């Protein structure tokens, strides 16, 4: 081919990966990767630019972000604004894009039988209406306004602004209405001309595309060649920044920051050269592995034993092509905030220990083999994120090593590691403390976020104490990981294998569901367990004691379980309104041992009083910090409280938290473990006799050490959902004391969860999805967060709209109703071919098979918690979905303005439309629930 400059030899992939690959480079400089998978249900594609926001003009901050926002609103060949997202929505696809300081990555997925139909327009994106600009400015401004009160954003932009102001690293990457609209209009700047002249940097020599589909590599080749050979090449050099943004006057500095949430954090930063070109060794991943370690003899073990720190993170943080950072961030207790100097001193003592011992080839080899195993048995990723990631990393690595570069280490060089250790010195350190105790003691304000902070010079006396750091006996190198898996044998599929989970055990003690892996065949396993006990959610006191018990358990087992978590065997342990939930996922080789240890700590728990006080104070800080959550999250929380029969508010939990005492908890743990039910789901590379052996092991341990007795069936009480009256409208109103934005959630309730109602609600939500996005966000520009979809809980379902905007919730609500009438007219005037097109799009949406094991076990567990046990739900409900006709009109007239069974409840969080009735304001949730009926429970299978 003349339009292909070169073709890669072969793509180094995993032997377990069945997908085909073919890399090539076109004549215009685009780095193309092709992935053929004849079995995928949805195809995907992604194009990555390497410019980003660090190349923004100094007078227009956020221009690349605004451009990424703008490329979706139509092109020359296709001028309509939402024809792209409407095409993807009508063909069971989605799209998105992000913009990092050195990247601008666009990505999308769609059904496998319209890949070219979508990819043509996606290519038109890279081959500007005034009204669309003036409208999208408000969307960017609502995005930044959404990111104003976010602590990570505040500290991020503050770290950008505390460096050299003349360096592009200090630029504001998001942008807002001032920098995009107000300031350019005041300075006579034509933002549209700036978009056209910027779209001099969008050259083909700095673009990397990745396409994944069912078609053959030759068809994908001819397609990408045809649609991308016409991209003009301008030979734009890749931007580099050899000068580090942090100069001497910015080093050895202390920054006192006041956060929004009541958090206590410590940030240590070391400027380092760009280590990207050292991807074959990854000394930042090595030093991060050693410093951030949590096992015995680590830094976090000492910081925890001294009662100063609870969690520690340390490693390499990416900066740009010319500069990078090496950060160590920790959380602070009330005592650790006063001993920050001692914490940093211990940090430099651990670093000095690493400089004294030197590099460790056995540690490097252990990381190499571990990463090789984790890469070989890596789960099959989702097409959109996979193509986006590969497209993002194509600029850094050759075509043959693009799949294995960030994962496989090959050469061990200690000169680099010793050099970075030479860079980790007190003369090149930056310290930032974040605490509320600095309130009123700050003198500086950040420009973009209004962050209050103070800047001081670190005393040369303290720097000298750091320079004379001796060797600490409490800091030792980690030992050999005893959780490294060595048995990858796939157990043969039993003859009694079932495509869906089967009930192989049903006793009064436990109920065991089991399924042998017959689709992925990977040496992994997911072991889910739910412990039912009425004392878990009987009152806020016992719920707080349960969360404190689980948190103390995980905190005590963190140091021991960090090696298994590093060996690809992780676990999650969280409390639920029905009892505890424990999940152990990963390699089944050494899974039963660690699981046995976790049960042993469940039944032999000894509470430390210091850990109890620290963790209790942390939970108090969490319940206090819920007031700083985002308005839409507060709306979902309030709607949850209103709809659920029994629910304790975080104010009740916070008030009852002070009454929790150590004798009460020590008397509460055996009271909880005295009467239990167990519902398990074992799904992985294990056999039936192995699953029965593990379950019987757990039961025998719980009985032996905890004397656990089964529960009575009459005590299996599930919660009902509040039933709204016909033609009834209720509005609950609260205020957000942190964010200056308003939130709103409208919820219409349906009858119950049956096949017909499920397909009605899902089909209608499929029809109104893209029109909801486009009407409420693209055209009217109400806010940045506009969502609409089905809501299911307690076996009852409904339709929900969730909007975060500046405008008042009553106006937002009236516009929602007017949009409902608009969709009524649209469906009444809709053609049968478009209706059947939504039917097919929803069918492809629902019949999408899971890509990895954890997703399938998550679907099974989702069918277990609901106690419906409908494993064949997709086939039956889609088979009924293809038989529906434009029923939907009667459903809209029955459930959704003058419907005889309209059930509407609105949540308003304070910062032509039809006439709406007078809503009943909710004064008290308890009276609200007492005055209204409750829905029945879904019958079991």
């Amino acid at each position, epitope marked *: 081919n003349p339009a292909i400059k070169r073709i890669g030899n072969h793509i180094t992939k995993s032997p377990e990966d069945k997908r085909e690959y073919r890399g090539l480079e076109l004549a215009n400089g685009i780095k193309v990767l092709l992935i053929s998978d004849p079995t995928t249900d949805k195809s995907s594609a992604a194009l990555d630019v390497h410019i980003g926001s660090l190349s923004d003009p100094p007078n227009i901050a956020g221009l690349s972000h605004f451009l990424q926002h703008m490329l979706f609103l139509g092109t020359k060949k296709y001028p309509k604004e939402n024809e792209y997202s409407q095409f993807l929505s009508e063909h069971a696809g989605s799209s998105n894009a992000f913009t990092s300081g050195e990247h601008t990555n666009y990505y999308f997925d769609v059904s496998h039988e319209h890949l070219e139909g979508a990819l043509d327009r996606f290519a038109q994106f890279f081959l500007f209406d005034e009204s669309a600009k003036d409208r999208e400015v408000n969307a960017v401004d609502s995005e930044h306004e959404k990111n104003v009160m976010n602590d990570a954003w505040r500290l991020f932009q503050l770290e950008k602004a505390t460096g050299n102001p003349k360096h592009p690293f200090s630029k504001f990457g998001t942008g807002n209405k001032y920098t995009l609209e107000t300031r350019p209009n005041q300075e006579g700047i034509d933002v549209r001309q700036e978009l056209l002249k910027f779209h001099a940097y969008y050259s083909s020599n700095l673009m990397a595309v990745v396409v994944l589909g069912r078609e053959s590599l030759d068809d994908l080749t001819n397609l990408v060649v045809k649609l991308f050979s016409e991209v003009e090449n301008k030979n734009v050099p890749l931007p580099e920044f050899p000068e580090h943004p942090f100069q001497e006057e910015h080093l050895k500095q202390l920054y006192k920051i006041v956060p929004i949430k009541d958090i206590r954090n410590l940030y240590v930063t070391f400027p380092i050269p760009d280590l990207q*070109k050292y991807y074959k060794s990854n000394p930042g991943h090595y030093l991060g592995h050693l410093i951030g370690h949590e096992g015995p003899g680590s830094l976090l073990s000492e910081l925890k034993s001294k009662g100063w720190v609870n969690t520690l993170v340390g490693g390499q943080k990416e900066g740009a092509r010319g500069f990078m950072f090496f950060i160590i961030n920790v959380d602070l207790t009330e005592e650790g905030l006063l001993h920050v100097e001692d914490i940093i001193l211990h940090m430099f003592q651990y670093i000095q220990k690493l400089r004294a011992e030197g590099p460790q080839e056995w540690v490097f080899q252990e990381l190499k083999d571990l990463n090789a195993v984790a890469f070989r048995f890596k789960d099959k990723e989702r097409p959109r994120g996979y193509t986006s990631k590969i497209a993002g990393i194509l600029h850094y690595y050759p075509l043959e090593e693009v799949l294995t570069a960030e994962y496989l280490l090959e050469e061990f060089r200690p*000169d680099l590691i010793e050099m970075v250790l030479d860079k980790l010195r007190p003369e090149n350190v930056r310290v930032a403390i974040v605490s509320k105790s600095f309130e009123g003691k700050t003198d500086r304000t950040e420009e973009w976020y209004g962050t209050q902070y103070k800047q001081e010079a670190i005393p040369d006396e303290v720097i000298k104490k750091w320079q004379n750091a001796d060797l600490n006996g409490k800091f030792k190198l980690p030992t050999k990981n005893e959780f490294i898996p060595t048995n990858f044998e796939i157990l043969p599929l039993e003859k009694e294998a079932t495509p869906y989970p089967a009930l192989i055990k049903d006793t009064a003690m436990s109920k065991l569901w089991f399924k042998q892996d017959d689709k992925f065949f990977l040496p992994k396993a997911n072991l889910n367990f739910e412990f039912f006990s009425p004392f878990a959610y009987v009152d806020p006191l016992h719920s707080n004691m349960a969360y404190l018990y689980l948190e103390l358990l995980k905190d005590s087992l963190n140091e021991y379980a960090y090696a298994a978590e590093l060996a690809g065997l992780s676990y999650d342990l969280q409390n639920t309104i029905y009892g505890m939930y424990l999940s152990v996922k990963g390699y089944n080789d050494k899974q039963p041992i660690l699981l046995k240890k976790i049960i042993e700590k469940m039944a032999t728990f000894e509470i430390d009083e210091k850990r109890f006080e620290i963790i209790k104070e942390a939970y108090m800080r969490s319940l206090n910090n819920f007031r700083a959550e985002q308005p839409h999250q507060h709306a979902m929380y309030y709607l949850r409280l209103l709809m659920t029969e029994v629910a304790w508010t975080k104010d009740e939990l916070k008030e009852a938290l002070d009454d929790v005492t150590l004798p009460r908890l020590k008397a509460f743990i055996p009271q909880l473990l005295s009467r239990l039910h167990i519902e398990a789901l074992l799904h992985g590379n294990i056999t039936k006799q192995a699953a029965l052996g593990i379950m019987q092991m757990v039961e025998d341990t719980l009985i032996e050490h905890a004397h656990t007795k089964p529960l009575l069936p009459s005590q299996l009480v599930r919660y009902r959902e509040v039933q709204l009256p016909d033609r009834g409208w209720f509005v609950y109103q609260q205020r957000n004391e942190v964010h200056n934005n308003s939130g709103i959630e409208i919820y219409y309730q349906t009858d119950m969860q049956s096949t017909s109602e499920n397909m009605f609600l899902e089909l209608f939500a499929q029809i109104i999805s893209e029109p909801a996005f486009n009407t409420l966000r693209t055209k009217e520009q109400l806010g940045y967060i506009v969502f609409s979809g089905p809501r299911r809980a307690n076996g009852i379902q409904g339709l929900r709209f969730i909007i975060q905007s500046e405008k008042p919730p009553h106006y937002l609500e009236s516009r929602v109703e007017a949009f409902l009438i608009t969709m009524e007219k649209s469906i009444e005037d809709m053609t049968e071919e478009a209706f059947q097109k939504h039917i097919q799009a929803l069918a492809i949406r629902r019949l999408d098979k899971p890509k990895k094991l954890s997703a399938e076990s998550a679907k099974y567990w989702g069918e277990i918690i609901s106690q419906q046990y409908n494993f064949d739900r997709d086939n039956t409900e889609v088979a009924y979905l293809k038989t529906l006709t434009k029923d939907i009109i009667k459903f809209y007239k029955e459930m959704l303005v003058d419907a005889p069974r309209r059930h509407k409840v609105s949540v308003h969080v304070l910062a032509q439309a039809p006439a709406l009735p007078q809503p009943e304001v909710i004064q008290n949730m308890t009276e609200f629930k007492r005055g209204l009926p409750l829905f029945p429970l879904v019958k079991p299978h």
Partner: antibody
Amino acid sequence: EVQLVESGGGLVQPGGSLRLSCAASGFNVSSYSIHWVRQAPGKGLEWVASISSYYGSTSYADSVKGRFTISADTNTAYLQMNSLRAEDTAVYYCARDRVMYYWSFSKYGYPYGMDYWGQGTLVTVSS
Amino acid sequence: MTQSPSSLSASVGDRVTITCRAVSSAVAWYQQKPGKAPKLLIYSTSSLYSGVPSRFSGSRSTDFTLTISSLQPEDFATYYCQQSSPSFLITFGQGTKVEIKR
């Protein structure tokens, strides 16, 4: 294909000067270290000098400190000999490190290989 | 620092071991043909250079050993052990000449 070429050797009267040139091809001298190693007539190998262009580091042997001066231009290496005695007559070779961005300032030595060499230029010092 | 022995003689297919004794705890191995430029044999004390016959083996006991189990008639050269050292230092030995006995 990576290779090196030496040029500049010849005959010089004792006490004279000479400039040896190690022109590199196939790579970038900016991202590699260059070594100069001579061999005496009938004797074993002997390291003369070394340079890391990235870190701007130079290294001389204890036999010649103020008489030799190593340097590099970004894509050719240069070894300067300002005063040659009758004992400096030898065959001079230049080589490169196999690994990239080798760190000069180190406490522990890491002996990597010198994969690619050159034919070398012979210098004799006689009247 | 030091190398042993000064010279050695063995037959074809015979096993030959050269003991180079030297900071740095590793060593490199090079093979210089008579007149021609030296050729890299072993960079890291464990592994060998790409394209080098498998009959060459680098070992360490303090003292490092180069091992040639099967000796070919084309392996006649002078072998030198290289030692890197701090302050960016490189040192060689006096070499070992292997004489083939037919």
